[PDB]
Design a protein around this nucleic acid. Structure first.
Length: 1244
DNA sequence: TAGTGTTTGTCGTCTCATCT
RNA sequence: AAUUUCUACUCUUGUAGAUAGCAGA
DNA sequence: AGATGAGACGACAAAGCACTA
């Protein structure tokens, strides 16, 4: 099983795009006929027609909801039982009960409810059937039903033209669906409004029982308005009335009984919403609510569990403190022998329940109240200071964009604060507080969309990529390329001197005139027209065109003798009665399908019927008009065919064929001149006259589609259903590099270091002698290093959108001869890997000093190669460009900068995809990524968490589904004819497992802070130790600390069976460890650059601000300094820890604990001095601790090298587990304990 | 009494309940 | 600063890589 | 928690009907 055998496995479809350049006078004819303006009127009638069409849905849905009468008592009991017992049995009971009620509403729409009679029930089915297709435009559905006359007009306007309404049809199915989707009407009734209405009835009866005078008072309010005159106040708070609360007019009356594109558009709309917040006095109402919390009962003010961790991180040291403080106080009030089961019950309770504010204060201390008060006034003051601050006049300057974002941050900050409180009625919420909070919470709700709408207004490019499809009054334009359907579709392809032209023939003067081109000899100069000949699928076409004809069926039903067909046949086709009888039996399993043989066993009759059917099929192929000549004899004899499946799989490729015939140039040019044909050259900058160099992949697909070898034997299919588009020019400010100016390169003379953006713009302005300001000192120093360029020719920025452009979307099917879908791809991958035990591993990790780092390991774990992918094609992404982008973010903190950073990240990951696939193909290795489910990356990494990287994995999977290398020849596997198929088709981010073809996924955590020589990891959770007694207990856990006089290194023997309270719970292998304090000698690497052994970089300066700045540290030096200062002897090699405890000095003990933490900190980095390395605090079997500063080629170079290398080892673990296991299945994830045990057993 | 302009044929994969 | 169009770019009226479009979040 | 199973939807030429002479 060669690695090159992973090709032609399953079909893959791609949609190529091209820009159509009108040829000759075709643009003049199109403008004269007004096809573009009519299509613009069509796409704009879409929005005009959409509300008109919605009248049908609104009316029909409203009419169906008027007859709904249900007993909601069962649904209420399922809601009560789930709130009563929080068990998974009551949850599934409620989920099923909701699905039952949703279907009860759905049966009113489709007409399958027992509550309505057959006459009414069947009338709804006749409407719901044609409710999501072209029957909306017939007026038939409207004839069953309510509309303006403009409706008739505009619905008649898309008759036989419902293509644009495709996705819209799905959006309307989401409205009437019975599934548990929030877009639907049944879901809104069952799971949204009824729990609200059910809660309203409970709030009502509780108030009336406690305060009976409130009953007559509520009744007076209902009578004084005029709503629900036939219904008393007790009945509107009873379940049967909810059946009359299913329509908007009734919902509006119910709610009223309770209640009584441009720059200036964002300023006028926000200031209108902003000035509305003053009149409602929502700030004064909010400031009054949070002031109530100082005196009201806080046992009924509840905090949402979904926000408790966020509040803990915003008001306390960590996210842990609140959940932990509540845990300790609840364990403090348990009864009897507190087992470990009772503790786990308290843990699980804190994950999914709302905590009242009093229990939080009683468990966290008075310092939370001060944090709650300070944070509340801080947010309220910023929102108060932003409502009176006026917006600027325009968004032209960045200083004016900043104040708009600043005021939105204050508005979103208050909106964030209000979502701290639980909204669900499951808790005993305060009467007045919950009403006043819910009021201002809903009045601050539009501020969230205003934040996103405003950020999108200014994080958008100056373009306008909006386009509308062109139909040319052709309902099925470019639907199929077949020559027979050429007249009905009107779309053909040409090719001339290597240039591909698209031609379409519009209707002539409102009528269909067919252009009959005359083929000539190849010696005649002219175009070459594609003669697309197709026959979709024999399995469906042969019965339809031969024996499923209505005339044939009628003749056989009425008459018995065989019939002859002389229509659409070169020679008449003889059809017998028996072939029809076999194709039309009295049982569902026909004798043709394997089901008959499976359920009967009559193999002889099965084979005889199959042979007769195949003979009839061959005769039909011979006798049919279009297939009479297409190489029918190439098939194998009919007798030995096993089943119809293989015969059709063999016959279908032979039916499809593409041929080219020379057509005189004069005829095509005269057709274009007359207006009968619209020529369009297909252009993608790879057909330009200035082109030189390897082309795009889509250009290669297009070229190889029409290659002679592909024409002779199909491998790329030209599918139908093509589309044409048109993009109006969208220019708002035209800038170009005109002749005589001076262009500045965005790179220095080294061609790898990009200029900072602001410095580049300033230098470009200065070079053209058009800068008023003097050059800055840094810019002046940078100027000698930059290279400027003269303008040879004009270069218009964003020239793509300075003129109207046509477009052509054509789909292709790569690997046409393969199967429709992959069949157990992972099993084949595992078989290949098992049969090739020496296949290397590729590990990819996101570093911190580089965006993407990769290391490849062989079967034995040796590093074959470690490379940095932060520089691609002579351009530094991480070390230079992303650093300047981050500096610009820190200097301004705008939105457009963040958007540009995201776009740059996406582009860089695209280049990384190319590099990864290149390395894959070179090494024939299996690539191991990291699954984003487990762990998260620190903010120091260049790549974000799960946002950009997760899309990168999907893009890599898609690339490897059909991988073509442009340097490879077409014939060789990997070229455009035989692409590599190395991964299964992507389905979903959650659905993909630990393996996807040659892509493996291993858990992210525990891959970087690991000693590559020993597998040692820092076991202590330093956040646990806080007090002096904790430090004493931690320090007394270790066995001894004796100073080796001969080597000058301290040895701190530690056993994993100690200090379990401070460990992370991962023993692994190696029960005992020997932590070593390296003597600070100056070691030399391969390059000879000196470095101090044992050097550590620590950020601990102050307890809270322990990350302000990194500090140098050499643990041995200050260890011996402290020992000398404290008057303790250590040169004798005696134990030191008991002496330290005997000294009982808090400063010495705290410094010792800090030293242990620092020495156990392996990854030491300092961006200011360009330092990033890992130092092992323990010795391996060789007797030396790892030090990446030695730059040993066989060991990781730096910390990112460590991460990538250990990801590769995790992938190797998975591969070895596969190899040893008999079954071809990969273990679902690797446990941290299991991985640690494996690596520590391997290293030791 | 023609003639000019949407449905069908069966097979493939998806997609919600479901036996084991 | 020139792109089916997205990123980065310029000795090269273009370069390297990626690119499955339609409708809608 | 992996299955089978009924039902629905994509593929596209050509058969085959809705309007006009």
């Amino acid at each position: 099983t060669q690695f090159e055998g992973f090709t032609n496995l399953y079909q893959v479809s791609k949609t190529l795009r091209f820009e159509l350049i009108p040829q000759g006078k075709t643009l003049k004819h199109i403008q004269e006929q007004g096809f573009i303006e009519e299509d613009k009127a069509r796409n704009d009638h879409y929005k005009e027609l959409k509300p008109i069409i919605d009248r049908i849905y609104k009316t029909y849905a409203d009419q169906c909801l008027q007859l709904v009468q249900l007993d909601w008592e069962n649904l209420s009991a399922a809601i009560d039982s789930y709130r009563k017992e929080k068990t998974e049995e009551t949850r599934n009971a409620l989920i099923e009960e909701q699905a039952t009620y949703r279907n009860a509403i759905h049966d009113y729409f489709i007409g399958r409810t027992d509550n309505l009679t057959d006459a009414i029930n069947k009338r709804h089915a006749e409407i719901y059937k044609g409710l999501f297709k072209a029957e909306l435009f017939n007026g038939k559905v409207l004839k069953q039903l309510t509309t303006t006359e403009h409706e008739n007009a505009l619905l008649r306007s898309f008759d036989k033209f419902t293509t644009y309404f495709s996705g819209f049809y799905e959006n309307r199915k989401n409205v009437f669906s019975a599934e548990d989707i929030s877009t639907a009407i049944p879901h809104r009734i069952v799971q949204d409004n009824f729990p609200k209405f059910k809660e309203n009835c409970h709030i009502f009866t509780r108030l009336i029982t406690a305060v009976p005078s409130l009953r007559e008072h509520f009744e007076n309010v209902k009578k004084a308005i005029g709503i629900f005159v036939s219904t008393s106040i007790e009945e509107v708070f009873s379940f049967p009335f909810y059946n009359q609360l299913l329509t908007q007019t009734q919902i509006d009356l119910y709610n009223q009984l309770l209640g009584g594109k441009s720059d200036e558009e964002v300023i006028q709309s926000f200031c209108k919403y902003k000035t509305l917040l003053r009149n409602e006095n929502v700030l004064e109402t909010a400031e009054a609510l949070f002031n109530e919390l100082n005196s009201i009962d806080l046992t009924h003010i509840f905090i949402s569990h979904k926000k408790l961790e966020t509040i803990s991180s915003a008001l306390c040291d960590h996210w842990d403190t609140l959940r932990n403080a509540l845990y300790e106080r609840r364990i403090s009030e348990l009864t009897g022998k507190i087992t470990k089961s009772a503790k786990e019950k308290v843990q699980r309770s804190l994950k999914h329940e709302d905590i009242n504010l009093q229990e939080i204060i009683s468990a966290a201390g008075k310092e939370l109240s001060e944090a709650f008060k300070q944070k509340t006034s801080e947010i309220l003051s910023h929102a108060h200071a932003a409502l009176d601050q006026p917006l600027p006049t325009t968004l032209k300057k960045q200083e004016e964009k900043e104040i708009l974002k600043s005021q939105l941050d204050s508005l979103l900050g208050l909106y964030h604060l209000l979502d701290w409180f639980a909204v669900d009625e499951s808790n005993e919420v305060d009467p007045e507080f919950s009403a006043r909070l819910t009021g201002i919470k809903l009045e601050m709700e539009p501020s969230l969309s205003f934040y996103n709408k405003a950020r999108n207004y200014a994080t958008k490019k100056p373009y306008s990529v909006e386009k509308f499809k062109l139909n040319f009054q052709m309902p099925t334009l470019a639907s199929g390329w077949d020559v027979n359907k050429e007249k009905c579709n009107g779309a053909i392809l040409f090719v001339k001197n290597g240039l591909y032209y698209l031609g379409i023939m519009p209707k002539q003067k409102g009528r269909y005139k067919a252009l009959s081109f005359e083929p000539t000899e190849k010696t005649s100069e002219g175009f070459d027209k594609m003669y697309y000949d197709y026959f979709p699928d024999a399995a469906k076409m042969i019965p339809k065109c031969s024996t499923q004809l209505k005339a044939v069926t009628a003749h056989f039903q009425t008459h018995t003798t065989p019939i002859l067909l002389s229509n659409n046949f070169i020679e008449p086709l003889e059809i017998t009665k028996e072939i029809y009888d076999l194709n039309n039996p009295e049982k569902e399993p026909k004798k043709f399908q394997t089901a008959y043989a499976k359920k009967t066993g009559d193999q002889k009759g099965y084979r005889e019927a199959l042979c007769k059917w195949i003979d009839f099929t061959r005769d039909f192929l011979s006798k049919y008009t279009k297939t009479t000549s297409i190489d029918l004899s190439s098939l194998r004899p009919s007798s030995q065919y096993k089943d119809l499946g293989e015969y059709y799989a063999e016959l279908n490729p032979l039916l499809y064929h593409i041929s080219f015939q020379r057509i005189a140039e004069k005829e095509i040019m005269d057709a274009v001149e007359t207006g009968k044909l619209y020529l369009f050259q297909i252009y993608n900058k790879d057909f330009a006259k200035g082109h030189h160099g390897k082309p795009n992949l889509h250009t290669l697909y297009w070229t190889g589609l029409f290659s002679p070898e592909n024409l002779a034997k199909t491998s790329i299919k030209l599918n139908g259903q093509a589309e044409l588009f048109y993009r109006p020019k969208s220019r708002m400010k035209r800038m170009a590099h005109r002749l005589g100016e001076k262009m500045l390169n965005k790179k220095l003379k080294d061609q790898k270091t990009p200029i900072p953006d602001t410095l580049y713009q300033e230098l470009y302005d200065y070079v053209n002698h058009r800068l008023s300001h003097d050059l800055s000192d840094e810019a002046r120093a940078l100027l000698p290093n930059v290279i400027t360029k003269e303008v040879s020719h004009e270069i218009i920025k964003d020239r793509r959108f300075t003129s109207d452009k046509f477009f052509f979307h054509v789909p292709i099917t790569l690997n046409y001869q393969a199967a429709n879908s992959p069949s157990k791809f992972n099993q084949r991958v595992n078989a290949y890997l098992k049969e090739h035990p020496e296949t290397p591993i590729i590990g990819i990790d996101r570093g911190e000093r580089n965006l993407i780092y990769i290391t490849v390991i062989d079967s034995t774990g040796k590093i074959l190669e470690q490379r940095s992918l932060n520089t691609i094609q002579q351009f530094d992404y991480q070390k230079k460009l992303d650093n300047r982008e981050k500096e610009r973010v820190a200097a301004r903190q705008a939105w457009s900068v963040v958007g540009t950073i995201k776009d740059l990240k996406q582009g860089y990951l695209s280049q990384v995809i190319h590099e990864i696939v290149d390395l894959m193909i070179h090494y024939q290795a299996v690539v191991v990524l990291e699954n984003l489910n487990f762990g998260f990356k620190s903010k120091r990494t260049g790549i974000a968490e799960k946002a950009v990287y997760q899309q990168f994995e999907k893009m890599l999977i898609d690339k490897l589904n059909c991988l073509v290398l442009k340097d490879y020849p077409a014939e060789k596997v990997g070229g455009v004819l035989n692409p590599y198929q190395l991964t299964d088709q992507f389905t979903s981010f959650a659905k993909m497992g630990t393996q996807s073809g040659f892509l493996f996924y291993v858990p992210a955590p525990y891959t970087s802070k690991i000693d590559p020589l020993t597998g040692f990891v820092d076991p202590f959770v330093w956040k646990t130790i806080k007090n002096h007694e904790s430090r004493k207990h931690f320090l007394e856990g270790f066995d001894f600390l004796h100073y080796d006089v001969k080597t000058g290194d301290f040895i701190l023997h530690f056993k994993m069976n100690r200090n379990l309270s401070f460990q992370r719970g991962l023993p692994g292998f190696m029960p005992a460890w020997d932590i070593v304090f390296e003597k600070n000698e100056t070691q030399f690497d391969a390059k000879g650059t000196p470095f101090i052994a044992g050097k550590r970089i620590v950020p601990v300066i102050e307890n809270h601000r322990f990350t302000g700045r990194y500090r140098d540290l050499y643990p041995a030096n200050e260890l011996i300094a402290l020992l000398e200062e404290k008057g303790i002897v250590f040169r004798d090699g005696s134990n030191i820890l008991p002496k330290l405890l005997e000294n009982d000095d808090s400063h010495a003990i705290d410094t010792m604990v800090a030293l242990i933490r620092s020495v156990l900190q392996m990854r030491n980095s300092n961006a200011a001095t360009g330092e990033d390395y890992i130092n092992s605090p323990v010795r391996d079997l060789n007797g030396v601790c790892f030090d990446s500063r030695f730059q040993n080629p066989e060991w990781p170079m730096d910390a990112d090298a460590n991460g990538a290398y250990h990801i590769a080892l995790k992938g190797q673990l998975l591969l070895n587990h596969l190899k040893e296991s008999k079954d071809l299945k990969l273990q679902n994830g690797i446990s941290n304990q299991d991985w640690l045990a494996y690596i520590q057993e391997l290293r030791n």
